[PDB]
Coordinates of C-alpha atoms in Angstrom, one line a residue:
Chain P
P1 CA 40.0 -9.9 -14.1
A2 CA 36.6 -8.0 -13.5
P3 CA 34.6 -7.6 -10.4
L4 CA 31.4 -9.8 -10.2
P5 CA 28.0 -8.0 -10.9
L6 CA 25.8 -7.1 -7.8
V7 CA 22.2 -7.7 -7.7
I8 CA 20.2 -5.8 -4.9
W9 CA 16.7 -6.7 -3.7
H10 CA 15.2 -4.1 -1.5
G11 CA 12.9 -4.6 1.5
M12 CA 9.4 -3.7 2.4
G13 CA 8.2 -0.1 2.2
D14 CA 11.1 0.6 0.0
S15 CA 11.9 0.7 -3.8
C16 CA 14.9 -0.1 -6.0
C17 CA 16.0 3.5 -6.6
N18 CA 15.5 5.7 -3.6
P19 CA 18.6 7.9 -3.4
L20 CA 18.5 7.8 0.6
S21 CA 18.2 3.9 0.5
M22 CA 19.2 1.6 -2.3
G23 CA 20.4 4.4 -4.3
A24 CA 23.1 5.3 -1.6
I25 CA 24.1 1.5 -1.4
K26 CA 24.6 1.5 -5.1
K27 CA 26.7 4.6 -5.2
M28 CA 28.6 3.4 -2.1
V29 CA 29.4 0.1 -3.8
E30 CA 30.4 1.8 -7.2
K31 CA 32.8 4.1 -5.5
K32 CA 34.8 1.2 -3.7
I33 CA 34.7 -1.2 -6.7
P34 CA 35.1 0.7 -10.0
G35 CA 33.3 -0.7 -13.0
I36 CA 31.0 -2.8 -11.1
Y37 CA 27.5 -3.5 -12.6
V38 CA 24.8 -3.1 -10.0
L39 CA 21.3 -4.1 -10.7
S40 CA 18.8 -3.0 -8.2
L41 CA 15.7 -5.2 -8.6
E42 CA 12.4 -3.3 -9.3
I43 CA 9.1 -5.3 -9.2
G44 CA 6.6 -3.0 -11.0
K45 CA 6.5 -0.4 -13.6
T46 CA 7.0 2.6 -11.2
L47 CA 8.8 3.3 -7.9
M48 CA 5.4 3.6 -6.2
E49 CA 4.2 0.2 -7.6
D50 CA 7.5 -1.3 -6.4
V51 CA 6.7 0.0 -2.9
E52 CA 3.2 -1.4 -2.8
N53 CA 4.2 -4.7 -4.5
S54 CA 6.7 -5.2 -1.5
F55 CA 3.4 -5.6 0.6
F56 CA 0.8 -6.9 -1.8
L57 CA 2.4 -9.0 -4.6
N58 CA 2.7 -12.8 -4.1
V59 CA 6.3 -13.6 -3.4
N60 CA 6.3 -16.8 -5.4
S61 CA 5.5 -14.5 -8.5
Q62 CA 8.0 -12.1 -7.5
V63 CA 10.7 -14.6 -7.6
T64 CA 9.7 -16.0 -10.9
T65 CA 9.8 -12.4 -12.3
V66 CA 13.3 -11.9 -10.8
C67 CA 14.4 -15.3 -12.3
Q68 CA 13.2 -14.1 -15.8
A69 CA 15.0 -10.8 -15.3
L70 CA 18.3 -12.5 -14.3
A71 CA 18.1 -14.9 -17.2
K72 CA 17.7 -12.0 -19.7
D73 CA 20.6 -9.8 -18.4
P74 CA 23.9 -10.6 -20.2
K75 CA 26.1 -9.1 -17.6
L76 CA 25.2 -11.8 -15.2
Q77 CA 25.7 -14.7 -17.4
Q78 CA 29.2 -15.6 -15.7
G79 CA 27.6 -15.3 -12.3
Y80 CA 26.7 -12.5 -9.8
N81 CA 26.7 -11.6 -6.1
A82 CA 23.4 -11.0 -4.5
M83 CA 22.5 -8.7 -1.6
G84 CA 19.0 -8.5 -0.1
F85 CA 17.9 -5.9 2.5
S86 CA 15.2 -6.9 5.0
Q87 CA 12.6 -9.2 3.3
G88 CA 14.8 -9.1 0.1
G89 CA 17.3 -11.3 2.1
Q90 CA 14.8 -14.4 2.2
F91 CA 13.8 -13.5 -1.4
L92 CA 17.1 -13.7 -2.7
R93 CA 17.7 -16.9 -0.9
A94 CA 14.5 -18.2 -2.7
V95 CA 16.0 -17.3 -5.9
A96 CA 19.2 -19.2 -5.0
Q97 CA 17.1 -22.3 -4.3
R98 CA 14.5 -22.0 -7.2
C99 CA 16.8 -20.6 -10.1
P100 CA 20.5 -21.5 -9.7
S101 CA 21.2 -20.3 -13.2
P102 CA 23.0 -17.9 -13.8
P103 CA 25.0 -18.8 -10.7
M104 CA 24.7 -16.7 -7.6
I105 CA 28.2 -16.7 -5.9
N106 CA 27.8 -14.8 -2.6
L107 CA 24.4 -14.3 -1.1
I108 CA 24.6 -11.3 1.4
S109 CA 21.6 -11.0 3.7
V110 CA 21.2 -7.6 5.4
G111 CA 18.7 -8.0 8.3
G112 CA 16.8 -10.8 6.4
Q113 CA 14.2 -12.9 8.2
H114 CA 15.2 -16.3 7.3
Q115 CA 12.9 -18.0 9.7
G116 CA 10.3 -15.3 9.1
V117 CA 8.6 -13.2 11.8
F118 CA 6.1 -13.4 14.5
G119 CA 5.3 -9.7 14.9
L120 CA 5.3 -6.4 13.1
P121 CA 5.9 -3.7 15.7
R122 CA 7.1 -1.1 13.2
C123 CA 7.3 -0.7 9.3
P124 CA 10.3 1.1 7.7
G125 CA 9.7 4.3 5.8
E126 CA 6.7 6.7 6.5
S127 CA 4.4 3.6 6.4
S128 CA 2.7 3.7 9.9
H129 CA -0.9 3.3 8.8
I130 CA -0.3 0.6 6.1
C131 CA 1.7 -1.1 8.8
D132 CA -1.2 -0.9 11.4
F133 CA -3.5 -2.4 8.6
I134 CA -1.0 -5.2 7.9
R135 CA -0.5 -6.1 11.6
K136 CA -4.2 -6.2 12.3
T137 CA -4.7 -8.4 9.2
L138 CA -1.9 -10.8 10.2
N139 CA -2.9 -11.2 13.8
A140 CA -6.5 -11.8 12.7
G141 CA -5.7 -14.3 9.8
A142 CA -2.2 -14.6 8.4
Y143 CA -2.9 -18.2 7.2
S144 CA -6.3 -17.9 5.4
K145 CA -6.1 -18.7 1.6
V146 CA -7.1 -15.2 0.6
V147 CA -4.6 -13.5 3.0
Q148 CA -1.8 -15.8 2.1
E149 CA -2.1 -15.1 -1.5
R150 CA -2.1 -11.4 -1.5
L151 CA -0.1 -10.0 1.5
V152 CA 3.7 -10.5 1.3
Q153 CA 4.3 -10.5 5.0
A154 CA 1.7 -13.2 5.6
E155 CA 3.9 -15.6 3.3
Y156 CA 6.8 -15.5 5.9
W157 CA 4.6 -15.1 9.0
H158 CA 5.8 -17.9 11.2
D159 CA 3.8 -18.7 14.2
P160 CA 5.9 -21.0 16.7
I161 CA 2.8 -21.8 18.9
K162 CA 0.6 -23.0 16.0
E163 CA 3.5 -24.5 14.1
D164 CA 1.6 -27.2 12.3
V165 CA -0.9 -24.5 10.9
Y166 CA 2.3 -22.6 9.7
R167 CA 3.6 -25.8 8.0
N168 CA 0.4 -26.7 6.2
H169 CA -0.7 -23.1 5.1
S170 CA 2.5 -21.0 4.4
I171 CA 2.8 -20.6 0.6
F172 CA 6.4 -19.3 0.7
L173 CA 8.5 -19.6 3.8
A174 CA 7.4 -23.1 4.7
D175 CA 8.5 -24.2 1.1
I176 CA 11.8 -22.6 1.0
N177 CA 12.5 -23.9 4.5
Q178 CA 11.7 -27.6 3.8
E179 CA 9.0 -27.6 6.4
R180 CA 6.5 -29.7 4.3
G181 CA 9.1 -32.0 2.7
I182 CA 12.7 -32.0 1.5
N183 CA 13.2 -30.5 -2.0
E184 CA 16.5 -31.9 -2.9
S185 CA 17.3 -29.3 -5.5
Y186 CA 16.7 -26.5 -2.9
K187 CA 19.4 -28.1 -0.8
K188 CA 21.8 -28.7 -3.6
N189 CA 21.5 -25.1 -5.0
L190 CA 21.8 -23.3 -1.5
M191 CA 25.1 -25.4 -0.8
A192 CA 26.4 -24.3 -4.4
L193 CA 27.0 -20.7 -2.9
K194 CA 30.6 -19.7 -2.2
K195 CA 29.5 -17.7 0.9
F196 CA 26.1 -17.0 2.6
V197 CA 26.6 -13.9 4.8
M198 CA 23.9 -12.8 7.4
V199 CA 24.0 -9.3 9.0
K200 CA 22.1 -9.1 12.3
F201 CA 21.3 -5.6 13.7
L202 CA 21.7 -5.8 17.5
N203 CA 19.2 -3.0 18.4
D204 CA 16.7 -4.0 15.8
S205 CA 13.0 -2.7 16.7
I206 CA 11.5 -4.0 13.2
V207 CA 12.2 -7.7 13.2
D208 CA 10.6 -10.0 15.7
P209 CA 12.6 -12.0 16.5
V210 CA 15.9 -10.5 15.8
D211 CA 17.3 -14.1 15.7
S212 CA 15.7 -14.7 12.3
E213 CA 18.4 -12.5 10.9
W214 CA 20.8 -15.3 11.7
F215 CA 18.4 -18.2 10.8
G216 CA 17.4 -18.6 14.4
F217 CA 13.9 -18.4 15.9
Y218 CA 11.4 -18.8 18.7
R219 CA 11.7 -22.2 20.1
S220 CA 8.6 -24.4 19.2
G221 CA 5.4 -24.1 21.2
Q222 CA 6.0 -20.7 22.8
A223 CA 7.0 -17.0 21.8
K224 CA 9.5 -15.7 24.5
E225 CA 12.7 -17.8 24.3
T226 CA 14.7 -17.9 21.0
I227 CA 17.1 -20.5 19.9
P228 CA 19.9 -20.2 17.3
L229 CA 20.2 -22.0 13.9
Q230 CA 22.3 -24.8 15.4
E231 CA 19.6 -25.9 17.8
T232 CA 16.8 -25.9 15.3
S233 CA 15.6 -29.2 13.4
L234 CA 16.2 -27.4 10.1
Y235 CA 19.9 -27.6 10.9
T236 CA 20.3 -30.8 12.9
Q237 CA 18.3 -32.9 10.3
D238 CA 20.0 -30.6 7.8
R239 CA 17.1 -30.1 5.4
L240 CA 18.8 -27.3 3.5
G241 CA 22.4 -28.3 3.9
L242 CA 23.1 -25.4 6.3
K243 CA 25.0 -27.9 8.5
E244 CA 27.3 -29.0 5.7
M245 CA 27.7 -25.3 4.8
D246 CA 28.4 -24.4 8.4
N247 CA 31.1 -27.0 8.7
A248 CA 32.6 -26.0 5.2
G249 CA 33.2 -22.4 6.1
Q250 CA 30.4 -21.2 3.9
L251 CA 28.4 -19.5 6.5
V252 CA 29.2 -16.0 7.9
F253 CA 27.3 -14.6 11.0
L254 CA 27.9 -10.8 11.1
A255 CA 26.5 -8.5 13.8
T256 CA 26.4 -4.8 14.0
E257 CA 25.0 -2.2 16.4
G258 CA 22.2 0.0 15.4
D259 CA 18.4 -0.4 14.4
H260 CA 17.1 -2.1 11.2
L261 CA 19.3 -1.5 8.1
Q262 CA 21.3 1.3 10.0
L263 CA 24.9 0.7 9.0
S264 CA 27.9 3.0 8.8
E265 CA 30.3 3.5 6.1
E266 CA 33.1 2.2 8.0
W267 CA 31.4 -1.1 8.9
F268 CA 30.0 -1.6 5.4
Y269 CA 33.5 -1.1 3.7
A270 CA 35.2 -3.2 6.5
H271 CA 32.8 -6.3 6.4
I272 CA 30.7 -6.3 3.3
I273 CA 32.8 -5.0 0.5
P274 CA 35.3 -7.8 0.9
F275 CA 32.6 -10.2 -0.2
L276 CA 32.1 -8.2 -3.3
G277 CA 35.5 -7.9 -5.0
Chain G
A1 CA -8.1 39.0 -6.5
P2 CA -9.3 35.6 -7.6
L3 CA -10.7 33.1 -5.2
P4 CA -8.1 30.3 -4.2
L5 CA -8.6 26.6 -5.1
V6 CA -8.2 23.7 -2.7
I7 CA -7.7 20.2 -4.5
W8 CA -8.1 16.8 -3.0
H9 CA -6.5 14.0 -5.1
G10 CA -8.2 10.5 -5.3
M11 CA -7.3 7.0 -4.5
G12 CA -3.8 5.8 -5.4
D13 CA -2.7 9.3 -6.1
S14 CA -0.9 12.2 -4.4
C15 CA -1.0 15.9 -4.1
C16 CA 1.8 16.5 -6.6
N17 CA 2.3 14.1 -9.5
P18 CA 3.1 16.1 -12.6
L19 CA 0.9 13.7 -14.8
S20 CA -2.0 14.0 -12.5
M21 CA -2.7 16.8 -9.9
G22 CA 0.3 18.7 -10.8
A23 CA -1.1 19.0 -14.4
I24 CA -4.3 20.3 -13.0
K25 CA -2.5 22.8 -10.7
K26 CA -0.2 24.2 -13.7
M27 CA -3.4 24.3 -15.9
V28 CA -5.5 26.4 -13.4
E29 CA -2.6 28.7 -12.7
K30 CA -2.1 29.4 -16.4
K31 CA -5.9 30.2 -17.1
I32 CA -6.4 32.2 -13.9
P33 CA -3.3 34.3 -13.3
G34 CA -2.2 34.7 -9.6
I35 CA -4.4 32.0 -8.2
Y36 CA -3.4 30.2 -5.1
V37 CA -4.0 26.5 -5.5
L38 CA -3.6 24.2 -2.3
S39 CA -3.2 20.6 -3.4
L40 CA -3.8 18.7 -0.2
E41 CA -1.1 16.3 1.0
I42 CA -2.2 14.0 3.9
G43 CA 1.3 12.6 4.8
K44 CA 5.0 13.5 5.3
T45 CA 6.0 12.2 1.9
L46 CA 4.2 11.7 -1.5
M47 CA 4.5 8.0 -0.9
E48 CA 2.6 8.2 2.4
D49 CA 0.1 10.4 0.7
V50 CA -0.8 7.6 -1.7
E51 CA -1.0 4.9 0.9
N52 CA -2.9 7.2 3.2
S53 CA -5.4 7.4 0.3
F54 CA -6.1 3.7 1.1
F55 CA -5.4 3.1 4.9
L56 CA -5.8 6.4 6.8
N57 CA -9.3 6.8 8.5
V58 CA -11.2 9.4 6.3
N59 CA -12.7 11.2 9.6
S60 CA -9.1 11.6 10.7
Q61 CA -8.2 13.0 7.2
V62 CA -11.3 15.4 7.2
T63 CA -10.5 16.8 10.7
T64 CA -6.9 17.4 9.6
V65 CA -7.6 19.2 6.4
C66 CA -10.1 21.4 8.2
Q67 CA -7.5 22.4 10.8
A68 CA -5.0 23.0 7.9
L69 CA -7.5 25.3 6.0
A70 CA -8.4 27.2 9.3
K71 CA -4.7 27.8 9.9
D72 CA -4.1 28.9 6.1
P73 CA -4.3 32.6 5.9
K74 CA -5.0 33.0 2.2
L75 CA -8.3 31.0 2.6
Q76 CA -10.0 33.0 5.5
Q77 CA -11.7 35.2 2.8
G78 CA -13.2 32.1 1.2
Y79 CA -12.2 29.3 -1.2
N80 CA -13.3 26.9 -4.1
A81 CA -12.8 23.3 -3.7
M82 CA -12.3 20.6 -6.3
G83 CA -12.2 16.9 -5.5
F84 CA -11.1 14.1 -7.7
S85 CA -12.6 10.7 -7.2
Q86 CA -12.9 10.0 -3.5
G87 CA -11.7 13.6 -2.9
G88 CA -15.1 14.5 -4.1
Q89 CA -17.0 13.1 -1.1
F90 CA -14.1 14.1 1.0
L91 CA -14.3 17.7 0.3
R92 CA -18.1 17.5 0.5
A93 CA -17.6 16.2 4.1
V94 CA -15.4 19.3 4.7
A95 CA -18.3 21.4 3.4
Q96 CA -20.7 19.7 5.8
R97 CA -18.3 19.7 8.8
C98 CA -16.0 22.6 8.5
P99 CA -18.1 25.7 7.4
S100 CA -15.4 28.3 8.4
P101 CA -13.6 29.2 6.5
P102 CA -16.4 29.3 3.9
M103 CA -16.3 27.0 0.9
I104 CA -18.0 28.9 -2.2
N105 CA -18.0 26.3 -5.1
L106 CA -17.5 22.5 -4.6
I107 CA -16.3 20.7 -7.8
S108 CA -16.8 16.8 -7.7
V109 CA -14.8 15.3 -10.4
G110 CA -15.9 11.6 -10.5
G111 CA -16.8 11.6 -6.7
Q112 CA -18.8 8.8 -5.2
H113 CA -21.4 10.6 -3.2
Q114 CA -23.6 7.5 -2.6
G115 CA -20.3 5.4 -2.3
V116 CA -19.6 2.2 -4.2
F117 CA -20.5 -1.4 -4.1
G118 CA -17.5 -2.7 -6.1
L119 CA -13.9 -2.0 -6.8
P120 CA -13.1 -3.5 -10.2
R121 CA -10.2 -1.3 -10.9
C122 CA -8.0 1.2 -9.2
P123 CA -6.4 4.3 -10.6
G124 CA -2.7 4.4 -11.6
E125 CA -0.2 1.3 -11.4
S126 CA -1.9 -0.3 -8.4
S127 CA -3.5 -3.4 -9.4
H128 CA -2.3 -5.6 -6.5
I129 CA -3.2 -3.3 -3.7
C130 CA -6.6 -3.1 -5.4
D131 CA -6.9 -7.0 -5.3
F132 CA -6.2 -7.0 -1.6
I133 CA -8.6 -4.1 -0.8
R134 CA -11.2 -5.7 -3.0
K135 CA -11.1 -9.1 -1.2
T136 CA -11.0 -7.3 2.2
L137 CA -14.1 -5.4 1.2
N138 CA -16.1 -8.4 0.0
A139 CA -15.2 -10.2 3.2
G140 CA -15.5 -7.8 6.0
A141 CA -16.1 -4.1 5.0
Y142 CA -18.3 -3.4 8.0
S143 CA -16.2 -5.3 10.8
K144 CA -15.0 -2.7 13.3
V145 CA -11.3 -3.5 12.5
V146 CA -11.6 -2.8 8.7
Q147 CA -14.0 0.2 8.9
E148 CA -11.7 2.1 11.2
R149 CA -8.6 1.7 9.0
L150 CA -9.5 1.2 5.3
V151 CA -10.7 4.2 3.4
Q152 CA -12.7 2.5 0.7
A153 CA -14.6 0.5 3.3
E154 CA -15.8 3.8 4.9
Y155 CA -17.8 4.5 1.7
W156 CA -18.5 1.0 0.8
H157 CA -22.3 0.9 0.5
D158 CA -24.1 -2.5 0.4
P159 CA -27.5 -2.0 -1.0
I160 CA -28.6 -5.6 -0.2
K161 CA -27.3 -5.2 3.4
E162 CA -28.6 -1.6 3.7
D163 CA -29.5 -2.1 7.4
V164 CA -25.9 -3.3 8.1
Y165 CA -24.4 -0.3 6.1
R166 CA -26.6 2.4 8.0
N167 CA -25.6 0.9 11.2
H168 CA -21.7 0.4 10.6
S169 CA -20.4 2.8 8.1
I170 CA -18.3 5.5 10.1
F171 CA -18.2 8.0 7.1
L172 CA -20.6 7.7 4.3
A173 CA -23.6 6.9 6.4
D174 CA -22.7 10.0 8.7
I175 CA -22.4 12.5 5.8
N176 CA -25.6 11.3 4.0
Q177 CA -27.8 11.4 7.2
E178 CA -28.6 7.7 7.2
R179 CA -28.6 7.6 11.0
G180 CA -30.3 10.9 11.9
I181 CA -30.4 14.5 10.5
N182 CA -27.4 16.5 11.7
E183 CA -29.2 20.0 11.0
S184 CA -25.9 21.8 10.4
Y185 CA -24.7 19.3 7.6
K186 CA -27.8 20.5 5.7
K187 CA -27.4 24.0 6.6
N188 CA -23.8 23.9 5.7
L189 CA -24.1 22.3 2.4
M190 CA -26.9 24.7 1.2
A191 CA -24.6 27.5 1.8
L192 CA -22.5 26.6 -1.1
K193 CA -23.1 28.8 -4.2
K194 CA -22.7 25.9 -6.6
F195 CA -22.1 22.2 -6.2
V196 CA -20.9 20.7 -9.4
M197 CA -20.9 17.0 -10.2
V198 CA -19.0 15.6 -13.1
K199 CA -20.0 12.0 -14.3
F200 CA -17.8 10.0 -16.7
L201 CA -19.9 8.1 -19.2
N202 CA -17.3 5.3 -19.9
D203 CA -16.2 4.9 -16.2
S204 CA -14.9 1.5 -15.5
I205 CA -13.8 2.4 -11.9
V206 CA -16.8 3.5 -10.1
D207 CA -19.5 0.9 -9.5
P208 CA -22.3 2.2 -9.9
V209 CA -21.3 5.2 -12.1
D210 CA -24.5 7.2 -11.1
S211 CA -22.8 7.5 -7.6
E212 CA -21.0 10.5 -9.4
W213 CA -24.5 12.2 -9.7
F214 CA -25.4 11.1 -6.1
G215 CA -27.5 8.1 -7.4
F216 CA -27.3 4.6 -6.4
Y217 CA -28.6 1.0 -6.6
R218 CA -32.2 0.7 -5.5
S219 CA -32.4 -0.6 -1.9
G220 CA -32.6 -4.4 -1.6
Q221 CA -30.8 -5.4 -4.9
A222 CA -27.8 -4.6 -6.9
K223 CA -28.8 -4.6 -10.7
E224 CA -31.1 -1.4 -11.1
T225 CA -29.9 2.0 -10.1
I226 CA -32.0 5.2 -9.4
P227 CA -31.0 8.9 -9.7
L228 CA -30.6 11.4 -6.9
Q229 CA -34.1 12.7 -7.3
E230 CA -35.9 9.5 -6.7
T231 CA -34.0 8.6 -3.6
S232 CA -35.4 9.1 0.0
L233 CA -32.2 11.3 0.7
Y234 CA -33.8 13.8 -1.8
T235 CA -37.6 13.0 -0.9
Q236 CA -37.1 13.8 2.7
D237 CA -34.4 16.4 1.8
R238 CA -32.1 15.4 4.7
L239 CA -29.2 17.3 3.2
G240 CA -31.0 20.3 1.5
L241 CA -30.2 18.8 -2.0
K242 CA -33.8 19.4 -3.2
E243 CA -33.9 23.1 -2.1
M244 CA -30.5 23.4 -3.8
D245 CA -31.7 21.7 -7.0
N246 CA -34.8 24.0 -7.2
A247 CA -32.5 27.0 -6.4
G248 CA -30.1 26.0 -9.3
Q249 CA -27.2 25.2 -7.0
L250 CA -26.7 21.6 -8.2
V251 CA -24.9 21.4 -11.7
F252 CA -24.7 18.1 -13.4
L253 CA -22.1 17.6 -16.1
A254 CA -21.4 14.4 -18.2
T255 CA -18.3 13.6 -20.2
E256 CA -17.8 10.7 -22.3
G257 CA -14.6 9.3 -21.1
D258 CA -13.4 6.7 -18.4
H259 CA -12.5 7.8 -14.9
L260 CA -10.6 11.2 -14.8
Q261 CA -10.4 11.2 -18.5
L262 CA -10.9 14.8 -19.8
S263 CA -9.7 17.1 -22.3
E264 CA -8.1 20.5 -21.7
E265 CA -10.8 22.2 -24.0
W266 CA -13.7 20.6 -22.0
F267 CA -12.0 21.6 -18.7
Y268 CA -11.5 25.2 -19.7
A269 CA -15.0 25.2 -21.1
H270 CA -17.0 23.8 -18.2
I271 CA -14.8 23.8 -15.0
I272 CA -12.9 27.0 -15.1
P273 CA -16.0 29.3 -15.0
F274 CA -16.8 28.1 -11.5
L275 CA -13.3 28.9 -10.5

């Protein structure tokens, strides 16, 4: 009886294979589950292209590229566990909904933004000036054709005030969240997951609002008060099956202290490794 | 006791890639033994260096490098400078703005001294950042929010909206005296012993390629170009480029390759003698 393979999808301003980031996660997992095969997804020919593609490659293409890669890797045929960091969380959810084959078994979301974001106060890495540019571009015109198509963070930019512009113009997050209409296969495929685990960082200064990490968001028509998944219409009308999943024990809501993606060895071993054996 | 060399990389590149600026460094160190080469890094990491080549204001980059050169002891006696691609016009801006310590020879390797009016292809594995920058430039290169943050916009040069360019460009229009004549820009540039310009005859990056020899599209349209010596920049000699040309201070080299594509033999033969 072997351990399931793990597929990792990194977040923004990061690559597959930085020893200090996804490299450390891979080693950490390999030590506590021996013989495990870990695929850290790279979208690009080099590590630097991987990093700039995390800002500038259309996520719908990224998802197709990753589906093709997963279809080609023989070690994943019998199924895999998936773990996304930051924006990689909602990307791997997208993979679960769009290509359910080979089967993802446990989706683990580490500080993902499943209802998107409405602000960009800080980028991970040494990325301040690219961040400043992205922020300005988003606040100026996140929902123009030309910006939607070419800026990754625009494609899960979720304005709770101008909600109907978000529904009509988001080329990624609005689709995977059933905002424009109910894709039945998305619901079916998300419900086929054994566990959907969501990690929230209580002192997170990157993700706005932090509630997006637990599939919650700003209440419609304003941008101060947040509401949890259970009070949103995505849940109560159950467009993705999250209410059926919540009732069936399939959803796990984990919270840790610390800023974005800052997690100790103790906690990781205590709460994430159990989902990977 | 050979003069030290200061290198400024181009767009989509860093100080220290073995296949790029690292290869230049190792090559110059072998041919000129005991030479001190400073490959400029504008950022904490190599990764920030690359993305600052796109998103850190050039005026902030130039004042930073000048401070970094003034504090460097090995350069107080003087130094040679070699700029690759945009590093070309950047180091020229150091020549014009930061005369102490004294730059001796300026080598522009595919620099864009009259800027660009197009971005059809970017160096390295960077096609998607290039798409975004291209669309942004063709939409709002001269809006205040873009100018202050996007490097390529700061040497974007619209010949059809020449009036708008002179008025809004916060870098190229300054160092090319498009607003007025900063008398020390001129005086400082003319203090170089040699200002060498390398043009790539198969360049598919730089639009228009003659910008590498300080030429550009004729004002008012974007089909026909004109060389340095027919432009009003040279007519009225706002930078001292005519006096330098007549004094034999301008050296123009052409090589047959695409952008930054040159052989070791050609380099040893034509570039090393200025170092």
